[PDB]
Design a protein around this ligand. Structure first.
Ligand SMILES: Cc1ncc(CO)c(CO)c1O
Length: 387
């Protein structure tokens, strides 16, 4: 049945995403452990990750379906070992750039991790499995997050020890990915027309267009929500109050993902209504936590936004997988993620980069909320016109 591959992939996703070093990544390599200045951290180290993510997402959707989705997952586990091995025993800027390159590899293979379970289970389970997979990742995150907090609050555990235990956690993920069942088998412009034979399936462009636009704004909000929280309440002790909140926020999203799988409600009739309702919910939450002058209301707004977006993206992924009617599961997911990454990079260059408009953090979340409201109103007007 579907139980064994789903369980193995959920174990792999949990043990590969439960990394306690994530909330304390910058403090780890901005202190005595690595002795790296913050100037090189955000200008010559982090953008390498984005460039690697784009460059390595370019071939993932091309070649994942050919290799039947397993070697790319195994490649994620291999890159997980290399990334944290270099982050453990690597000094200087040069090692960090390779670390970000391998993390871009890791995410480009996370795309294949998402596509694999649809490549191996029958379509009837495509709903249930969907939620579970997403939920697991989210769950892993919050689990790891709280673990890190505990090891800062109840163990006095150094960041190096957090990193090595995270490497051990992703080491088990590699072993679980080794045991994943293998999916069964099955003039450049011609390939493009092949895409035209895949993106015309039961208006899958609509869900894909939402994915290509909503998740870019979601990633930007994730990147800059810590900055907004620091700006709103400039407290030196807010860090413990910040990351932990993200944890529970992620947990909320997990529940939302678990909302999709567990309940048995048709989504091919409620897909448009759910999309528009939770998109206007995302817009309202983004506007709520920008305007309110209290960090608790902003925390609630962020939790609502993250949970609603996670539910929406679970629905989007399930509906794309079901309506695809072609085996190219990682091509659609890969191209959607690549287009969304391009949009996110362009809009963060326009909005945040000095070469761009360079809006302040006060107006950054206003324009994020306006962008999400525009996205919601596009589907509001389309649904009303279609009726
Ligand atoms: C090594 C490494 N590089 C870049 C990022 C994204 O900020 C992450 C995610 O925290 C990461 O782990």
């Amino acid at each position: 049945s579907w139980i064994y591959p789903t369980v193995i992939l959920c174990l792999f996703g949990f043990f590969s995403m439960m990394r306690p070093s994530e909330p304390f990544l910058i403090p780890y390599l901005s202190g005595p452990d690595k002795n790296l200045t913050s100037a090189e951290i955000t200008n010559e180290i982090f953008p390498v990750w984005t460039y690697s993510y784009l460059v390595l997402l370019l071939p993932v959707f091309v070649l994942t379906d050919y290799v039947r989705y397993k070697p790319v997952i195994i490649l994620q586990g291999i890159s997980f070992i290399i990334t944290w091995l270099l982050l453990l025993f690597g000094q200087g800027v040069k090692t960090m750039q390779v670390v970000e390159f391998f993390y871009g590899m890791v995410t480009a293979a996370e795309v294949a991790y998402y596509a694999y379970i649809y490549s191996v289970v029958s379509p009837e389970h495509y709903q249930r499995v969907s939620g579970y997979c997403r939920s697991v990742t989210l769950a892993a995150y919050t689990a790891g997050s709280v673990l890190a907090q505990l090891l800062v609050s109840l163990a006095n555990m150094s960041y190096f020890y957090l990193n090595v235990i995270s490497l051990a956690s992703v080491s088990v993920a590699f072993l679980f990915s080794l045991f994943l069942p293998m999916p069964k088998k099955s003039v450049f412009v011609q390939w493009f027309q092949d895409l035209k034979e895949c993106y015309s399936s039961k208006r899958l462009f609509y869900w894909s267009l939402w994915w290509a636009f909503a998740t870019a704004g979601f990633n930007q909000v994730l990147n800059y929500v810590q900055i907004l929280w620091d700006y709103k309440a400039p407290s030196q002790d807010s860090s413990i109050y910040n990351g932990a909140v993200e944890a529970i926020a992620t947990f909320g999203g997990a529940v939302a993902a678990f909302a999709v799988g567990y309940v048995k409600v048709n989504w091919d009739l409620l897909g448009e209504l759910a999309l528009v309702v939770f998109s206007v919910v995302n817009a309202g939450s983004l506007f709520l936590m920008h305007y309110t002058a209290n960090i608790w209301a902003c925390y609630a707004g962020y939790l609502i936004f993250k949970s609603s977006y996670m539910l929406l993206i679970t629905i989007a992924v399930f509906q794309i997988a079901v309506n695809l009617n072609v085996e190219r599961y990682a091509l659609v997911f890969g191209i959607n993620t690549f287009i969304a990454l391009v949009i996110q990079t362009i809009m963060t260059v326009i909005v945040v980069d000095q070469r761009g408009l360079n809006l302040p953090v006060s107006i950054q979340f206003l324009v994020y909320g306006s962008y999400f409201a525009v996205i919601a109103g596009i589907f509001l007007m389309r649904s009303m016109y279609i009726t």
